[PDB]
Structure 1
Amino acid sequence: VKCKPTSPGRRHVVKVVNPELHKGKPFAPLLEKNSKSGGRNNNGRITTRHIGGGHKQAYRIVDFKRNKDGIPAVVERLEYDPNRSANIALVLYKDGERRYILAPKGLKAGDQIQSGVDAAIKPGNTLPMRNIPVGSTVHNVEMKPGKGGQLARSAGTYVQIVARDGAYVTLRLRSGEMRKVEADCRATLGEVGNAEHMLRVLGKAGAARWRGVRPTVRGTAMNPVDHPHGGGEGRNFGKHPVTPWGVQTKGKKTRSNKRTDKFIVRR
């Protein structure tokens, strides 16, 4: 914590750690545009991505891209959205249609917010990269000019472009190094999502952790047959990967597809 406002520290009286509340989202619950979405940890056959049980789901919610151009929206209120801590926004277009957006930073009431070409550079709506200044303030881009995915993880995520980087390809995702991309693609330009979120510590397993993910921790736990390294008196030695894949360093994804980008880390 360091900014406004003051984040509770949860007064330990039961072995309980701080949480991170907001203020409100004036309506404890959604609207009419949301699905149920089933929920598994099996792939229409076996386990896979082992670990993942928790409970209570539903609540799909949606909309991205923001193809709806030159037609303004008003933000009725912020709101919730599970598994993806990054708020959400709601929005109303002058014609009575209601999407959901993705709450960037400061916003709340009214707020212009409009997509289109040369709409209005600030932190409002989407906008083809073909028209973006410093863009030191860009949001969820589109790996393809039409989709609308990329970093729907608005939770304080960045993609600072480079202002007027011509050539028709640039960008600079967060820690994901840099990677050139088209320009017809659009970006919310809000460039935020309230990072203060992802800062309080879950708490103490069950009390909040268990709700979603299971005991992902397995360690060696011995039993030289279940894991590549196990057994022994009380210790383990030897290499320590997982299914002769090697866990330390390595790297994967070969000849994949694009593979046209750059910079990246190493160590």
Structure 2
Amino acid sequence: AVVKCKPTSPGRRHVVKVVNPELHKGKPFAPLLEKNSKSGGRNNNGRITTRHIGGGHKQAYRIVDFKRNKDGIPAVVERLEYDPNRSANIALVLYKDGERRYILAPKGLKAGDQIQSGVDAAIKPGNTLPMRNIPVGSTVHNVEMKPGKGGQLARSAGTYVQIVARDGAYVTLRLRSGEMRKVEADCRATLGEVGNAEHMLRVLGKAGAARWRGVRPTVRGTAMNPVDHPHGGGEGRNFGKHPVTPWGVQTKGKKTRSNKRTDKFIVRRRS
């Protein structure tokens, strides 16, 4: 649900947890588990190329299926498990032939519900089926970009995609950020919205629940000296500049959409 905690100590006065009674209270399925070494924001050169990540708790990766390539086989969803890597929870799917996988959990997906992939499937929520056979208007998720790529769009918590058109061999999508965009109709998609849509109501309470979630403190550019940031300096919080990045690029309202390879697929833009 949505649990507003009680102020026993300061720094508990603003916590809201999302206590999910459905999820599994046990150690996960080990044949799909592996390690995941954090970077800390650094790459081959060893430099912090993306700032403000580091620390945090350990979190082992789960090989979560996206392509849904057991095609034509029924599948029992066996338990819901919490996943560290994603906003949404994973489900331990048992296929009929004794193979277990993980999938992303859609909204209505409780334990024991029978999903299945393939082109020859029902329009039950949770099924994977290609987009020339999904009825127009119906709401999908775990959307692909390329056929057989696996799944790129609408794969976070409560995130869905309304299929809006069917243009010959294309599908005009209404993405979650409100950007109509064409994909090839042979791409598979999974029906419903994604579960755990209550994740928007988590308010984290204190600094520590950021710092163990991977975040590191983000210093305002005004507090820095002028050699450090393009802002910065002035005795007594002067600002007087047009607000920019640490690398001098105009932030706060300056578009950077320059690909032109993928301007074929865009219909509408974010508004």
Q: What TM-score, normalized to structure 2?
A: 0.76
Name the CA shift for 1:204/1:93 in 2 (closer, same or farther; >3 Å). same
Contact 1:41 1:50 in 2 (8 A): no
Name the CA shift for 1:74/1:182 in 2 (closer, same or farther; >3 Å). same
Partner of 2:38: 36
Q: Distance in 1 between matches of 2:46 and 2:7?
A: 45
Percentage identity across aligned positions? 100
Q: What is the SS of the residue equivalent to 1:198?
A: helix
Contact 1:90 1:101 in 2 (8 A): yes
1:161 aligned residue (154, 163, 177): 163
Contact 1:87 1:193 in 2 (8 A): yes
- After superposing the two structures, state which structure 1 stretch, 175-184 or 43-52, moved more: 43-52
Q: What is the SS of the residue equivalent to 2:183?
A: coil
Q: What is the SS of the residue equivalent to 1:99?
A: strand
Contact 1:70 1:116 in 2 (8 A): yes
List per-residue Cα deviations over 1:96-138 (Å, max 9, x = no partner): 0011010101222221201111411121221100101144321
Question: How much has 1:67 moved relative to structure 2?
Answer: 1.4
Question: How much has 1:33 moved relative to structure 2?
Answer: 11
Contact 1:54 1:214 in 2 (8 A): no
Partner of 1:255: 257
- After superposing the two structures, state which structure 1 stretch, 101-110 or 189-198, moved more: 189-198
List per-residue Cα deviations over 1:166-215 (Å, max 9, x = no partner): 55231110114111111000101132222112212011111444431100
Name the CA shift for 1:52/1:152 in 2 (closer, same or farther; >3 Å). farther
Query: Larger strand proportion, structure 1 or 2?
Result: 2
Question: How much has 1:38 moved relative to structure 2?
Answer: 9.8
Gaps of 5+ in 1: none
Q: What TM-score, normalized to structure 1?
A: 0.77
Q: What is the SS of the residue equivalent to 1:179?
A: strand
Question: How much has 1:39 moved relative to structure 2?
Answer: 8.4
Contact 2:14 2:203 in 1 (8 A): no
Name the CA shift for 1:78/1:14 in 2 (closer, same or farther; >3 Å). closer
Name the CA shift for 1:206/1:19 in 2 (closer, same or farther; >3 Å). farther
Contact 1:145 1:185 in 2 (8 A): yes
Partner of 1:246: 248
Question: How much has 1:238 moved relative to structure 2?
Answer: 2.4
- After superposing the two structures, state which structure 1 stretch, 132-141 or 49-58, moved more: 49-58
Question: How much has 1:148 moved relative to structure 2?
Answer: 1.5
1:184 aligned residue (186, 197, 201): 186
Question: How much has 1:243 moved relative to structure 2?
Answer: 4.7
Name the CA shift for 1:194/1:36 in 2 (closer, same or farther; >3 Å). same
Contact 1:34 1:60 in 2 (8 A): no
Question: How much has 1:232 moved relative to structure 2?
Answer: 1.0
Contact 1:19 1:202 in 2 (8 A): no
Partner of 1:77: 79
Q: 1:120-131 counterparts in 2 under 5 A?
A: 120-131=122-133
Contact 1:8 1:20 in 2 (8 A): no
Name the CA shift for 1:55/1:113 in 2 (closer, same or farther; >3 Å). same
Name the CA shift for 1:218/1:250 in 2 (closer, same or farther; >3 Å). closer
Q: Distance in 2 between matches of 1:149 and 1:105?
A: 18
Question: How much has 1:79 moved relative to structure 2?
Answer: 0.3
Contact 2:41 2:49 in 1 (8 A): no
Gaps of 5+ in 2: none
Name the CA shift for 1:213/1:249 in 2 (closer, same or farther; >3 Å). closer
**Equivalences, count:** 267
Contact 2:119 2:129 in 1 (8 A): yes
